[PDB]
Design a protein around this ligand. Sequence first.
Ligand SMILES: O=P(O)(O)O[C@H]1[C@H](OP(=O)(O)O)[C@@H](OP(=O)(O)O)[C@H](OP(=O)(O)O)[C@@H](OP(=O)(O)O)[C@H]1OP(=O)(O)O
Ligand SMILES: [Zn+2]
Lengths: 36, 92, 177, 167, 55, 131, 368, 22, 150
Amino acid sequence: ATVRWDYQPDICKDYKETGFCGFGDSCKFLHDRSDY
Amino acid sequence: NTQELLDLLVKCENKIQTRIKIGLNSKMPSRFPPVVFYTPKELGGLGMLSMGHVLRSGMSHEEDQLIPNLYRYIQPWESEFIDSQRVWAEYA
Amino acid sequence: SNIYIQEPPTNGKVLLKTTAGDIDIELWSKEAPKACRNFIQLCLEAYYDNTIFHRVVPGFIVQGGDPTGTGSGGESIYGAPFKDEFHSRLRFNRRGLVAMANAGSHDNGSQFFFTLGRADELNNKHTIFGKVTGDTVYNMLRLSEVDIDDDERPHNPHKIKSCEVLFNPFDDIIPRE
Amino acid sequence: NMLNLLIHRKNLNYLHLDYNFNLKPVKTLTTKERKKSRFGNAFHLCREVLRLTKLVVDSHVQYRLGNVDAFQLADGLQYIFAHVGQLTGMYRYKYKLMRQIRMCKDLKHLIYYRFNTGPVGKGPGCGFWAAGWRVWLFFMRGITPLLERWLGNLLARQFEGRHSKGV
Amino acid sequence: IRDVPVLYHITGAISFVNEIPWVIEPVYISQWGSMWIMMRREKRDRRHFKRMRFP
Amino acid sequence: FGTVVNALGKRVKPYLPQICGTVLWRLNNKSAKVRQQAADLISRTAVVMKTCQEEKLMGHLGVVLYEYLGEEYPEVLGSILGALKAIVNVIGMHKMTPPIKDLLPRLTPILKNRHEKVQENCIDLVGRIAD
Amino acid sequence: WEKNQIPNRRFTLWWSPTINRANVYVGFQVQLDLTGIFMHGKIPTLKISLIQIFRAHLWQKIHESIVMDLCQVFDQELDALEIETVQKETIHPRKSYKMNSSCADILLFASYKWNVSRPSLLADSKDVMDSTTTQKYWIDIQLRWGDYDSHDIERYARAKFLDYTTDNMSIYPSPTGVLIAIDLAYNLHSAYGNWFPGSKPLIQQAMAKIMKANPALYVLRERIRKGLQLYSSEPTEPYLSSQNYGELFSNQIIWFVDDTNVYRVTIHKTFEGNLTTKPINGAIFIFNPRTGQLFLKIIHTSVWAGQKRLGQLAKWKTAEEVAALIRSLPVEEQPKQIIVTRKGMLDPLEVHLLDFPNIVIKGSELQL
Amino acid sequence: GGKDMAQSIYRPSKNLDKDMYG
Amino acid sequence: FRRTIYLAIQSSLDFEECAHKLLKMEFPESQTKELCNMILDCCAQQRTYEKFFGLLAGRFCMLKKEYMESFEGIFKEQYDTIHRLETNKLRNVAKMFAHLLYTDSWSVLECIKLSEETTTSSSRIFVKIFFQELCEYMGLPKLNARLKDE
Ligand SMILES: O=P(O)(O)O[C@H]1[C@H](OP(=O)(O)O)[C@@H](OP(=O)(O)O)[C@H](OP(=O)(O)O)[C@@H](OP(=O)(O)O)[C@H]1OP(=O)(O)O
Ligand SMILES: [Zn+2]
């Protein structure tokens, strides 16, 4: 079985940038903040 | 004594478990053996009370295995009635 | 349980006894019959005996095959520089490759070089007639360990002491006298 | 070559198509890139059908190279056709394919049972593809006109333009 | 080795195989019956039947 | 405990691994009771865990405590931030095992937290680093 | 447990070894971005929480810190192992999560020369160093995330070793080396590869320590605890110490053997007044910690009839009976290690177990 | 009975021991 | 074997199903004592009297002639523990034999005796119940018969 990199991150861009998600706890995304 | 109920319970258990399946994205049975639904959540399962594996085959079992039914652990109304009368008389 | 490595099977084998130890070369004589014929015959002719390795570029190549040791010399068995031969299945992805040096197209002499690493810029330029077998690989690399003087020349260049052809794929090779 | 030309034609430089037809992305994608880069089922169906043929042909090629053996090649071919759902991914894009997959699974049961009857065990080596091979051909007979119509439209949108009116 | 007839656009764009595999029914069947036998014998006899890796 | 250790000085050094082992294992236990307490224990034991030059322990406390900043119980989280504070006053800026680039923006959203101790210690630490 | 948000998302992690499987009907095996985890099918929540677990290149940190730890370990042992020098290759940044090929993590350069044995398991014991000799030696560190279907570390180790060694793509300076695989998901560790004198005990001890020690692993473990919101009930933990019994039950079938009561004797007086000794029925004590399975071998006095002195015979017969018992045992139940109460038993067992060379024999610093 | 059985699984002492011992 | 019995019995609604599940398994017959010993203990030990566990013991008798014997034995085995068992489980038993004996799986009784000589105050209650149940079925007249011919 061949392997394909997943490279897309799930980080929520609103929370990564600002630090507050409008969706709150319901966010479909990562909420991990500020990594490079 | 109601077969229609037993059917309804079976299909309905299968509908809520099927819905939880939908919740993640899979319908694949090998990815949801009953141990995940029927584990008491103390060990991290869902703690689902299940009356629908009873016997036509109601529901699947990964192995031969087994599942306990609620009805077996509840005392019937008749018996609890007689018990009530006796218990009260003895209490007096 | 599959990890694939694709390369066509080789044919022929030649032993180089050097001051750096033994080096086993597996040749592709299906892909490069011209340069492998040249190499096999020049080895059978004792043409590579006591020939140094005159050019070492760190982590790139180590070059030898010149009877004069100057680096501009050497000649083929064909009385003239012979043709280049290329294949999509023979590439430089790695060290351990044994290829033909040239100053241009159809320039192939008797000079050859070992790959110290990846060169992707020599693709479709130098012909790849062989590879060094893993067991002997380190010894090739010891050819590249020297104190290098001006113009990429080692101060104490390693030499090829003798040559043995372990398996000759060609029927018709007649060494010259 | 076709599929790479399509990819380039649209300037999707952050996608990468490898030689066994797996479409991957070079980097993590930006939102906008993700929108633009989606292919529809037409392209993916085509890609997966090509993948299937590459599996087949490669198998023959290794036989010709003398890496394999006749008997091994036969067994490989039977494997391929029985296992399409786990080598390709065609279904992803067309789910109806499951209909062929089931046929192949059944015929593999049937044949394998009869074949491995006596001394012969559960081991890997049964060649007897003819059946599985049939099944994919029937599939292809029908799907061809579909892909012609869908890829036709894809090309036509690419070159003529998405129709403006939405009439 | 089977050789086949081919129509290729003068441009190299596309090759089509221009042919239908017609067979004589009783011959065809016989030949795959033969293969049934052979394949079964081969599986019986090889110590370890190594199988190809995909792709 | 704090007075005992600070009084013992570096005679306490052989005892650290037992201490901090207890400190992490207790640092789990059952939440609301003892988390705050083990945290405060770290806070007051900071300097001793510093001057004796056990750096692995500062890695431990640094990233381990870093991880609890998502704790939902305020009365715990406050003690956590306090512990971080005390760790900042011993090991310096550029040597922080959780480099400030990580830490500070991870602190920033917490300011909504209402209940008191969090706001207190939080604003304090944002003060120390911001200064 | 923690007495439209996470709790759902948490439920996935807890079953994640079962939810995600190496064996599935249909799936396209995908590698998570910077990590070595392979998802089968697309599970959004699983993906998310895993990406929480590994963040800021925690995978790379783990591989790195492990390597460094080994580097220091060998930096201590230079003399005892006759090592000329130890160099850590500055690691190719992506090598940790690249699953197709691996460079060499550590290079041991010998002071003189090393007799090297055939490749065997880390858990293996009997080796013959007469196989070959060399100087340069390499060490590779492999991190995989297990699952329910294959959590077995050892077959994985020997597999990756045979592959990377026999592949032309992977670059190693010397054919002699070893590959260490650690499964994070199950916290397991094994190794397969070449050996040289003194290396096996050092590596065993070093791994057993690191698995208890390395801060990176503790960051992983803690992040798992937090994502799962598991919290232990009891302080101080049970009596763990560094003691080898916690890791001793593990997966590996391992036995305790006690010969003390095998040879027993009763004394009574004759008419001369001389105390005379008649031996009595003995028994061989064998116990399994994880199953509570007690093999009690009743040794009748018929064994004691005519042969010289009874003690040494008790010893050698004891080792014999253990050997035959393991002989009649199915392979799935066979012990990976056998630990001994009385060090005097070490010699006969080691002999009588030669027919089963992979069984480790260890004496107890722990009286029981 | 982990959390059911007692507030503390372990307390040591010989106080009760050396008292009731005699 | 003892564990499989429990799981098969706890699994099944009805009393019919457990026998089918149990017979189906085709566990070794001689054990057909202890098994039944299992059923008598397993429910009687179980907290309160339930109709199911008593029926099962009986059917298991009609299917094979031995199973009946296996039971009557197990009733004997009580003498030793007539005193010993604690004063709840007598409440499960007295009736529980009441339902084998009303439905004919009587004279096996006779072994039981009334004496201040030897009767356990346990046993006193045991038999006491046994009649206050079996009566409530036969209704003290059919019981008049069964005794009068007993
Ligand atoms: O015996 P083998 O030659 O190795 O065949 C196996 C096996 O067949 P049997 O178990 O019937 O012998 C599997 O059966 P199960 O393990 O699933 O019971 C089958 O699986 P399916 O039931 O899905 O066919 C599996 O295929 P796979 O590994 O994909 O499940 C298939 O071997 P292949 O993989 O070689 O088909
Ligand atoms: Zn968000």
